[PDB]
């Protein structure tokens, strides 16, 4: 009858930049999705390998909640097998993911008149992330032919870039908070069950 703390995942006082995404581990608790189904704030609620009309009836070995901010047009990339700057360089789901992806518009909290420019994403990287890999390094990226020696220049870029979150952007350029719940089902007693 330990209720799982979805309140502190979905309504956390701070959300991470997608390049430095946060993971919270959920276990030893009862997960009621009623607050989640009854959101009418969520614009995305997609599950993979499981039905969302079954969740309160299911138990899992472990559950992880990954969370971060991206722009609206990029929510499509938070799904298995996707490509693009977020799926390739920031947050990668395994080809065989089991879990759910929940997202909602956070313009009111994460935008500022004149712009909030402190949510960042990785814009360059030499190779794709591995699934669930997290890369917070900040080494200068060689985009041209001449090596950079750690100096920024016209072809030598800091690898992160800022989103420009201002409330007048169209929704595809507005901030969305994302929570990814991965359900891992192992050959063991369940620690996360519905009611």
């Amino acid at each position: 009858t330990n209720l799982c703390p979805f309140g502190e995942v979905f309504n956390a006082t701070r959300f991470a930049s997608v390049y430095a995404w946060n993971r919270k581990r959920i276990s030893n608790c009862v997960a009621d999705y009623s607050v989640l189904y009854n959101s009418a704030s969520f614009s995305t609620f997609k599950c993979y390998g499981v039905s969302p009309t079954k969740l309160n009836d299911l138990c899992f070995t472990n559950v992880y909640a990954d969370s971060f901010v991206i722009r609206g047009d990029e929510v499509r990339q938070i799904a298995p097998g996707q490509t693009g700057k977020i799926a390739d360089y920031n947050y990668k789901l395994p080809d065989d993911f089991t879990g759910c992806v929940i997202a909602w518009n956070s313009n009111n909290l994460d935008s500022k008149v004149g712009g909030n420019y402190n949510y960042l994403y990785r814009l360059f990287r030499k190779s794709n992330l591995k699934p669930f890999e997290r890369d917070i390094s900040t080494e200068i990226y060689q985009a041209g032919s001449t090596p950079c020696n750690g100096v920024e220049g016209f072809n030598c870029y800091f690898p992160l870039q800022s989103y420009g979150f201002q409330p007048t952007n169209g929704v595809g350029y507005q901030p969305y908070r994302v929570v990814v719940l991965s359900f891992e089902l192992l050959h063991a007693p369940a620690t996360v069950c519905g009611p």
Partner: nanobody, 118 residues
């Protein structure tokens, strides 16, 4: 949106200060840059100013003559150009430094014309 301004007709040897004011995805908190396009050539980087970690950098043809600066509070980038040369004649654009290699950056402004009389 973005407004660049300050361009004009100047004698050789003269000066110009360009101003850029950008908001949203035309601004970057990591690095902002001035670029230029001479007629019939391709865009060229002129100067970039990282918000930290690193000093501003300049095209070889303008080092010692141009100075890039910022005001983070007003979302402004500035290019002070001294000792101007006829071949500095071009349209000058302001954008995030990474814009030339960002396949998603489609927010290039109309620019401001600088013309240097010979």
């Amino acid at each position: 949106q973005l407004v660049e301004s300050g361009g004009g007709l100047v004698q050789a040897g003269g000066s110009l200060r360009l101003s850029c004011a950008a908001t949203g995805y035309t601004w970057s908190s990591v690095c902002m840059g001035w670029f230029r396009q001479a007629p019939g050539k391709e865009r060229e980087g002129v100067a970039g100013i990282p918000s930290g970690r690193n000093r501003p950098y300049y095209a070889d043809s303008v080092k010692g003559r141009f100075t890039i600066s910022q005001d983070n509070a007003k979302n402004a980038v500035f290019l002070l150009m001294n000792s101007l040369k006829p071949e500095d004649t071009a349209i000058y654009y302001c954008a995030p430094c990474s814009a030339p290699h960002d396949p998603e950056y489609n927010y290039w402004g109309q620019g401001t014309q600088v013309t240097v009389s010979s």
